[PDB]
DNA sequence: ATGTATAACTGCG
DNA sequence: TCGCAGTTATACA
């Protein structure tokens, strides 16, 4: 059971394949059944002064009593469901890391995507990581650095059943997108777990 | 108060 | 197809 450690100036990440085809497939199907995404008005964001709707499908889940601002739109996460607990318990029992909140993204195909984002936030616990889990289609994850100087970009194929671990830094211009890959045709579900403040 | 960042898009090469 | 340039009008640090 092996890990890859990702390092560049300001960057610390740890990719691994947590799940074999045995359960990752079983879980993927159980996710498609049960996960309820946001629709219409709740699936919208304000970026650069306009409202758009997300080129994907989103959901939030978590412990009771929390709120999460996502790009100028604040909701309360839906209570946990048996499959999300089932996963979280596995991640936690392996990473020794607890989480109260997860943000779920379904991408129907290679043009369903997400845009460059800094985790720069004070909504996360003081020193705590972010666990990114993926199921379905293998898709590229991208890290870009803000600058002024020329240091490279970190591309990463996130496979069916794989865990990516990222540390939250308090001072980093590392942005993360998951760009369009037109050639991809299968669906992809992606759950990033977080530890949220309860102050909200 | 005055600076600065933005989870999205289109139109180029 | 893919990546990079340029947003845009409030929001908030």
PDB file of C-alpha atoms (C1' of nucleotides) in Angstrom:
ATOM      1  CA  UNK A   1       0.000   0.000   0.000  1.00  0.00           C
ATOM      2  CA  UNK A   2       2.071   2.841  -1.371  1.00  0.00           C
ATOM      3  CA  UNK A   3       2.120   6.630  -1.330  1.00  0.00           C
ATOM      4  CA  UNK A   4       3.567   9.262  -3.601  1.00  0.00           C
ATOM      5  CA  UNK A   5       4.790  12.449  -1.943  1.00  0.00           C
ATOM      6  CA  UNK A   6       4.407  15.643  -3.939  1.00  0.00           C
ATOM      7  CA  UNK A   7       6.785  18.507  -3.181  1.00  0.00           C
ATOM      8  CA  UNK A   8       7.486  21.878  -4.749  1.00  0.00           C
ATOM      9  CA  UNK A   9       8.111  25.242  -3.050  1.00  0.00           C
ATOM     10  CA  UNK A  10       5.064  25.704  -0.805  1.00  0.00           C
ATOM     11  CA  UNK A  11       3.498  22.386  -1.786  1.00  0.00           C
ATOM     12  CA  UNK A  12       2.993  19.178   0.218  1.00  0.00           C
ATOM     13  CA  UNK A  13       0.686  16.444  -1.055  1.00  0.00           C
ATOM     14  CA  UNK A  14       0.306  12.672  -0.780  1.00  0.00           C
ATOM     15  CA  UNK A  15      -1.372  10.600  -3.492  1.00  0.00           C
ATOM     16  CA  UNK A  16      -2.340   6.954  -2.993  1.00  0.00           C
ATOM     17  CA  UNK A  17      -4.819   4.353  -4.202  1.00  0.00           C
ATOM     18  CA  UNK A  18      -6.946   3.707  -1.114  1.00  0.00           C
ATOM     19  CA  UNK A  19      -9.573   1.513  -2.817  1.00  0.00           C
ATOM     20  CA  UNK A  20      -9.272  -1.531  -5.091  1.00  0.00           C
ATOM     21  CA  UNK A  21     -11.797  -2.280  -7.860  1.00  0.00           C
ATOM     22  CA  UNK A  22     -13.514  -4.648  -5.408  1.00  0.00           C
ATOM     23  CA  UNK A  23     -15.082  -1.878  -3.316  1.00  0.00           C
ATOM     24  CA  UNK A  24     -14.433   1.310  -5.294  1.00  0.00           C
ATOM     25  CA  UNK A  25     -16.845   0.017  -7.976  1.00  0.00           C
ATOM     26  CA  UNK A  26     -19.346  -1.121  -5.322  1.00  0.00           C
ATOM     27  CA  UNK A  27     -19.131   2.314  -3.670  1.00  0.00           C
ATOM     28  CA  UNK A  28     -19.364   4.256  -6.945  1.00  0.00           C
ATOM     29  CA  UNK A  29     -22.725   2.597  -7.664  1.00  0.00           C
ATOM     30  CA  UNK A  30     -23.885   3.275  -4.089  1.00  0.00           C
ATOM     31  CA  UNK A  31     -22.922   6.938  -4.546  1.00  0.00           C
ATOM     32  CA  UNK A  32     -24.928   7.281  -7.768  1.00  0.00           C
ATOM     33  CA  UNK A  33     -28.001   5.866  -6.030  1.00  0.00           C
ATOM     34  CA  UNK A  34     -27.905   8.002  -2.896  1.00  0.00           C
ATOM     35  CA  UNK A  35     -26.203  11.384  -3.411  1.00  0.00           C
ATOM     36  CA  UNK A  36     -28.633  14.276  -3.924  1.00  0.00           C
ATOM     37  CA  UNK A  37     -27.067  17.240  -5.726  1.00  0.00           C
ATOM     38  CA  UNK A  38     -28.061  20.900  -5.718  1.00  0.00           C
ATOM     39  CA  UNK A  39     -30.317  22.103  -8.541  1.00  0.00           C
ATOM     40  CA  UNK A  40     -31.196  25.482 -10.017  1.00  0.00           C
ATOM     41  CA  UNK A  41     -30.713  28.427  -7.678  1.00  0.00           C
ATOM     42  CA  UNK A  42     -28.519  26.532  -5.209  1.00  0.00           C
ATOM     43  CA  UNK A  43     -26.195  25.318  -7.965  1.00  0.00           C
ATOM     44  CA  UNK A  44     -25.020  28.838  -8.788  1.00  0.00           C
ATOM     45  CA  UNK A  45     -21.979  31.003  -8.055  1.00  0.00           C
ATOM     46  CA  UNK A  46     -20.846  34.629  -8.316  1.00  0.00           C
ATOM     47  CA  UNK A  47     -17.420  34.913  -9.960  1.00  0.00           C
ATOM     48  CA  UNK A  48     -16.137  38.152 -11.527  1.00  0.00           C
ATOM     49  CA  UNK A  49     -19.458  39.930 -10.954  1.00  0.00           C
ATOM     50  CA  UNK A  50     -21.771  37.520 -12.794  1.00  0.00           C
ATOM     51  CA  UNK A  51     -23.825  34.563 -11.638  1.00  0.00           C
ATOM     52  CA  UNK A  52     -23.145  31.311 -13.489  1.00  0.00           C
ATOM     53  CA  UNK A  53     -24.242  27.746 -12.912  1.00  0.00           C
ATOM     54  CA  UNK A  54     -21.540  25.205 -12.184  1.00  0.00           C
ATOM     55  CA  UNK A  55     -20.392  23.118 -15.180  1.00  0.00           C
ATOM     56  CA  UNK A  56     -20.965  20.032 -12.986  1.00  0.00           C
ATOM     57  CA  UNK A  57     -23.114  18.871 -10.076  1.00  0.00           C
ATOM     58  CA  UNK A  58     -22.389  19.802  -6.461  1.00  0.00           C
ATOM     59  CA  UNK A  59     -23.475  18.808  -3.005  1.00  0.00           C
ATOM     60  CA  UNK A  60     -22.400  19.452   0.548  1.00  0.00           C
ATOM     61  CA  UNK A  61     -22.706  17.105   3.499  1.00  0.00           C
ATOM     62  CA  UNK A  62     -21.595  17.411   7.125  1.00  0.00           C
ATOM     63  CA  UNK A  63     -22.224  17.348  10.881  1.00  0.00           C
ATOM     64  CA  UNK A  64     -25.230  19.310  12.139  1.00  0.00           C
ATOM     65  CA  UNK A  65     -24.747  22.978  13.058  1.00  0.00           C
ATOM     66  CA  UNK A  66     -22.418  24.092  10.271  1.00  0.00           C
ATOM     67  CA  UNK A  67     -22.579  26.506   7.349  1.00  0.00           C
ATOM     68  CA  UNK A  68     -20.366  26.756   4.251  1.00  0.00           C
ATOM     69  CA  UNK A  69     -19.912  29.734   1.933  1.00  0.00           C
ATOM     70  CA  UNK A  70     -19.220  28.551  -1.595  1.00  0.00           C
ATOM     71  CA  UNK A  71     -18.468  31.499  -3.908  1.00  0.00           C
ATOM     72  CA  UNK A  72     -20.958  33.963  -2.405  1.00  0.00           C
ATOM     73  CA  UNK A  73     -23.575  31.370  -1.494  1.00  0.00           C
ATOM     74  CA  UNK A  74     -24.048  30.008   2.035  1.00  0.00           C
ATOM     75  CA  UNK A  75     -25.960  26.816   2.862  1.00  0.00           C
ATOM     76  CA  UNK A  76     -26.150  24.290   5.652  1.00  0.00           C
ATOM     77  CA  UNK A  77     -24.699  20.888   4.631  1.00  0.00           C
ATOM     78  CA  UNK A  78     -27.054  17.900   4.467  1.00  0.00           C
ATOM     79  CA  UNK A  79     -26.738  15.310   7.259  1.00  0.00           C
ATOM     80  CA  UNK A  80     -24.445  12.328   6.642  1.00  0.00           C
ATOM     81  CA  UNK A  81     -25.684   9.214   4.838  1.00  0.00           C
ATOM     82  CA  UNK A  82     -24.448   5.602   5.475  1.00  0.00           C
ATOM     83  CA  UNK A  83     -22.128   5.520   2.434  1.00  0.00           C
ATOM     84  CA  UNK A  84     -20.414   8.833   3.256  1.00  0.00           C
ATOM     85  CA  UNK A  85     -19.792   7.660   6.823  1.00  0.00           C
ATOM     86  CA  UNK A  86     -18.558   4.329   5.401  1.00  0.00           C
ATOM     87  CA  UNK A  87     -15.946   6.171   3.320  1.00  0.00           C
ATOM     88  CA  UNK A  88     -14.994   8.819   5.916  1.00  0.00           C
ATOM     89  CA  UNK A  89     -14.403   6.068   8.502  1.00  0.00           C
ATOM     90  CA  UNK A  90     -11.952   4.360   6.130  1.00  0.00           C
ATOM     91  CA  UNK A  91     -10.039   7.572   5.320  1.00  0.00           C
ATOM     92  CA  UNK A  92      -9.959   8.528   9.014  1.00  0.00           C
ATOM     93  CA  UNK A  93      -8.862   5.091  10.274  1.00  0.00           C
ATOM     94  CA  UNK A  94      -5.978   5.237   7.775  1.00  0.00           C
ATOM     95  CA  UNK A  95      -4.885   8.913   7.888  1.00  0.00           C
ATOM     96  CA  UNK A  96      -5.578   9.371  11.611  1.00  0.00           C
ATOM     97  CA  UNK A  97      -7.524  12.421  10.527  1.00  0.00           C
ATOM     98  CA  UNK A  98     -11.096  13.422  11.351  1.00  0.00           C
ATOM     99  CA  UNK A  99     -13.506  15.462   9.183  1.00  0.00           C
ATOM    100  CA  UNK A 100     -16.892  17.138   9.764  1.00  0.00           C
ATOM    101  CA  UNK A 101     -17.676  18.291   6.215  1.00  0.00           C
ATOM    102  CA  UNK A 102     -17.428  17.087   2.619  1.00  0.00           C
ATOM    103  CA  UNK A 103     -17.966  18.822  -0.727  1.00  0.00           C
ATOM    104  CA  UNK A 104     -19.126  16.460  -3.513  1.00  0.00           C
ATOM    105  CA  UNK A 105     -18.671  17.002  -7.270  1.00  0.00           C
ATOM    106  CA  UNK A 106     -20.039  14.876 -10.098  1.00  0.00           C
ATOM    107  CA  UNK A 107     -18.624  15.356 -13.578  1.00  0.00           C
ATOM    108  CA  UNK A 108     -20.816  13.683 -16.230  1.00  0.00           C
ATOM    109  CA  UNK A 109     -17.973  13.700 -18.791  1.00  0.00           C
ATOM    110  CA  UNK A 110     -14.681  15.364 -19.769  1.00  0.00           C
ATOM    111  CA  UNK A 111     -16.200  18.838 -20.279  1.00  0.00           C
ATOM    112  CA  UNK A 112     -17.893  18.948 -16.887  1.00  0.00           C
ATOM    113  CA  UNK A 113     -15.070  20.664 -14.986  1.00  0.00           C
ATOM    114  CA  UNK A 114     -14.040  23.078 -12.232  1.00  0.00           C
ATOM    115  CA  UNK A 115     -12.044  26.293 -12.254  1.00  0.00           C
ATOM    116  CA  UNK A 116      -8.790  27.500 -10.694  1.00  0.00           C
ATOM    117  CA  UNK A 117      -9.321  27.932  -6.923  1.00  0.00           C
ATOM    118  CA  UNK A 118      -7.210  28.808  -3.882  1.00  0.00           C
ATOM    119  CA  UNK A 119      -8.159  27.015  -0.665  1.00  0.00           C
ATOM    120  CA  UNK A 120      -7.063  30.273   1.005  1.00  0.00           C
ATOM    121  CA  UNK A 121      -9.723  30.238   3.732  1.00  0.00           C
ATOM    122  CA  UNK A 122     -10.072  30.808   7.462  1.00  0.00           C
ATOM    123  CA  UNK A 123     -13.130  28.526   7.441  1.00  0.00           C
ATOM    124  CA  UNK A 124     -10.873  25.506   7.968  1.00  0.00           C
ATOM    125  CA  UNK A 125      -9.611  24.230  11.347  1.00  0.00           C
ATOM    126  CA  UNK A 126      -6.373  25.850  12.561  1.00  0.00           C
ATOM    127  CA  UNK A 127      -3.859  23.253  11.315  1.00  0.00           C
ATOM    128  CA  UNK A 128      -5.655  20.547   9.340  1.00  0.00           C
ATOM    129  CA  UNK A 129      -5.531  18.809   5.949  1.00  0.00           C
ATOM    130  CA  UNK A 130      -7.949  18.233   3.050  1.00  0.00           C
ATOM    131  CA  UNK A 131      -8.576  14.718   1.773  1.00  0.00           C
ATOM    132  CA  UNK A 132      -9.608  14.464  -1.901  1.00  0.00           C
ATOM    133  CA  UNK A 133     -11.144  11.129  -2.909  1.00  0.00           C
ATOM    134  CA  UNK A 134     -12.055  10.159  -6.469  1.00  0.00           C
ATOM    135  CA  UNK A 135     -14.239   7.491  -8.074  1.00  0.00           C
ATOM    136  CA  UNK A 136     -14.887   6.658 -11.720  1.00  0.00           C
ATOM    137  CA  UNK A 137     -13.064   8.260 -14.636  1.00  0.00           C
ATOM    138  CA  UNK A 138      -9.360   9.000 -14.282  1.00  0.00           C
ATOM    139  CA  UNK A 139      -8.964  12.746 -14.690  1.00  0.00           C
ATOM    140  CA  UNK A 140      -6.130  15.287 -14.495  1.00  0.00           C
ATOM    141  CA  UNK A 141      -5.734  17.524 -11.429  1.00  0.00           C
ATOM    142  CA  UNK A 142      -3.676  20.677 -11.814  1.00  0.00           C
ATOM    143  CA  UNK A 143      -1.670  22.845  -9.421  1.00  0.00           C
ATOM    144  CA  UNK A 144      -0.561  26.298 -10.601  1.00  0.00           C
ATOM    145  CA  UNK A 145       1.566  28.826  -8.684  1.00  0.00           C
ATOM    146  CA  UNK A 146       0.482  32.513  -8.687  1.00  0.00           C
ATOM    147  CA  UNK A 147       3.699  34.096 -10.040  1.00  0.00           C
ATOM    148  CA  UNK A 148       7.496  37.113 -11.442  1.00  0.00           C
ATOM    149  CA  UNK A 149       9.487  33.841 -11.412  1.00  0.00           C
ATOM    150  CA  UNK A 150       9.338  30.584 -13.419  1.00  0.00           C
ATOM    151  CA  UNK A 151       8.706  27.386 -11.435  1.00  0.00           C
ATOM    152  CA  UNK A 152       6.658  24.515 -12.869  1.00  0.00           C
ATOM    153  CA  UNK A 153       3.071  23.186 -12.765  1.00  0.00           C
ATOM    154  CA  UNK A 154       1.989  19.937 -11.088  1.00  0.00           C
ATOM    155  CA  UNK A 155      -0.321  17.732 -13.195  1.00  0.00           C
ATOM    156  CA  UNK A 156      -1.798  14.671 -11.535  1.00  0.00           C
ATOM    157  CA  UNK A 157      -3.952  11.784 -12.821  1.00  0.00           C
ATOM    158  CA  UNK A 158      -6.476  10.956 -10.068  1.00  0.00           C
ATOM    159  CA  UNK A 159      -7.557   7.348 -10.562  1.00  0.00           C
ATOM    160  CA  UNK A 160     -10.675   5.365  -9.661  1.00  0.00           C
ATOM    161  CA  UNK A 161     -10.524   4.878  -5.886  1.00  0.00           C
ATOM    162  CA  UNK A 162      -7.619   7.201  -5.123  1.00  0.00           C
ATOM    163  CA  UNK A 163      -6.990   9.509  -2.165  1.00  0.00           C
ATOM    164  CA  UNK A 164      -5.142  12.803  -2.486  1.00  0.00           C
ATOM    165  CA  UNK A 165      -4.043  14.510   0.738  1.00  0.00           C
ATOM    166  CA  UNK A 166      -3.337  18.239   0.776  1.00  0.00           C
ATOM    167  CA  UNK A 167      -2.230  20.467   3.623  1.00  0.00           C
ATOM    168  CA  UNK A 168      -4.093  23.647   3.991  1.00  0.00           C
ATOM    169  CA  UNK A 169      -0.957  26.366   4.182  1.00  0.00           C
ATOM    170  CA  UNK A 170      -1.589  29.661   5.418  1.00  0.00           C
ATOM    171  CA  UNK A 171       0.609  31.311   2.786  1.00  0.00           C
ATOM    172  CA  UNK A 172       0.616  29.686  -0.654  1.00  0.00           C
ATOM    173  CA  UNK A 173      -0.424  30.783  -4.144  1.00  0.00           C
ATOM    174  CA  UNK A 174      -1.038  27.217  -5.196  1.00  0.00           C
ATOM    175  CA  UNK A 175      -4.287  27.199  -7.113  1.00  0.00           C
ATOM    176  CA  UNK A 176      -6.116  23.995  -8.022  1.00  0.00           C
ATOM    177  CA  UNK A 177      -8.302  23.316 -11.032  1.00  0.00           C
ATOM    178  CA  UNK A 178      -9.518  20.170 -12.729  1.00  0.00           C
ATOM    179  CA  UNK A 179      -9.458  21.266 -16.386  1.00  0.00           C
ATOM    180  CA  UNK A 180     -11.510  20.113 -19.381  1.00  0.00           C
ATOM    181  CA  UNK A 181     -10.396  16.821 -20.948  1.00  0.00           C
ATOM    182  CA  UNK A 182     -12.675  16.517 -23.995  1.00  0.00           C
ATOM    183  CA  UNK A 183     -11.495  12.966 -24.737  1.00  0.00           C
ATOM    184  CA  UNK A 184     -12.967  11.660 -21.458  1.00  0.00           C
ATOM    185  CA  UNK A 185     -16.506  10.247 -21.639  1.00  0.00           C
ATOM    186  CA  UNK A 186     -17.215   8.398 -18.351  1.00  0.00           C
ATOM    187  CA  UNK A 187     -18.643  10.052 -15.210  1.00  0.00           C
ATOM    188  CA  UNK A 188     -16.492  11.088 -12.200  1.00  0.00           C
ATOM    189  CA  UNK A 189     -17.449  11.672  -8.543  1.00  0.00           C
ATOM    190  CA  UNK A 190     -15.056  13.545  -6.254  1.00  0.00           C
ATOM    191  CA  UNK A 191     -15.380  14.141  -2.526  1.00  0.00           C
ATOM    192  CA  UNK A 192     -13.089  16.565  -0.749  1.00  0.00           C
ATOM    193  CA  UNK A 193     -13.316  16.265   3.037  1.00  0.00           C
ATOM    194  CA  UNK A 194     -12.562  19.198   5.352  1.00  0.00           C
ATOM    195  CA  UNK A 195     -12.575  20.126   9.024  1.00  0.00           C
ATOM    196  CA  UNK A 196     -14.744  23.240   9.459  1.00  0.00           C
ATOM    197  CA  UNK A 197     -14.741  25.826  12.261  1.00  0.00           C
ATOM    198  CA  UNK A 198     -18.237  25.497  13.850  1.00  0.00           C
ATOM    199  CA  UNK A 199     -17.957  29.299  14.339  1.00  0.00           C
ATOM    200  CA  UNK A 200     -19.211  29.723  10.734  1.00  0.00           C
TER     201      UNK A 200
ATOM    202  C1'  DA B   1     -11.334  54.787   3.452  1.00  0.00           C
ATOM    203  C1'  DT B   2      -8.534  52.360  -0.726  1.00  0.00           C
ATOM    204  C1'  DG B   3      -6.825  47.634  -2.551  1.00  0.00           C
ATOM    205  C1'  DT B   4      -7.392  43.196  -4.007  1.00  0.00           C
ATOM    206  C1'  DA B   5      -9.285  38.718  -5.049  1.00  0.00           C
ATOM    207  C1'  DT B   6     -12.767  35.901  -7.802  1.00  0.00           C
ATOM    208  C1'  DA B   7     -14.553  27.640  -7.450  1.00  0.00           C
ATOM    209  C1'  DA B   8     -16.903  31.380 -13.924  1.00  0.00           C
ATOM    210  C1'  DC B   9     -16.881  32.443 -19.120  1.00  0.00           C
ATOM    211  C1'  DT B  10     -15.451  33.458 -24.401  1.00  0.00           C
ATOM    212  C1'  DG B  11     -11.803  34.122 -27.942  1.00  0.00           C
ATOM    213  C1'  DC B  12      -8.118  33.850 -29.568  1.00  0.00           C
ATOM    214  C1'  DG B  13      -2.694  30.552 -30.931  1.00  0.00           C
TER     215       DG B  13
ATOM    216  C1'  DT C   1      -8.010  19.863 -27.921  1.00  0.00           C
ATOM    217  C1'  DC C   2      -5.576  22.308 -24.842  1.00  0.00           C
ATOM    218  C1'  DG C   3      -3.810  26.597 -22.393  1.00  0.00           C
ATOM    219  C1'  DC C   4      -3.368  31.111 -21.739  1.00  0.00           C
ATOM    220  C1'  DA C   5      -5.184  36.081 -21.776  1.00  0.00           C
ATOM    221  C1'  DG C   6      -8.645  39.047 -20.178  1.00  0.00           C
ATOM    222  C1'  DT C   7     -12.012  39.716 -17.677  1.00  0.00           C
ATOM    223  C1'  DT C   8     -15.988  42.269 -14.114  1.00  0.00           C
ATOM    224  C1'  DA C   9     -18.718  44.655 -10.334  1.00  0.00           C
ATOM    225  C1'  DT C  10     -19.310  43.822  -6.017  1.00  0.00           C
ATOM    226  C1'  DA C  11     -17.211  41.835  -1.724  1.00  0.00           C
ATOM    227  C1'  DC C  12     -14.304  41.983   1.862  1.00  0.00           C
ATOM    228  C1'  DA C  13      -9.635  42.376   4.265  1.00  0.00           C
TER     229       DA C  13
END
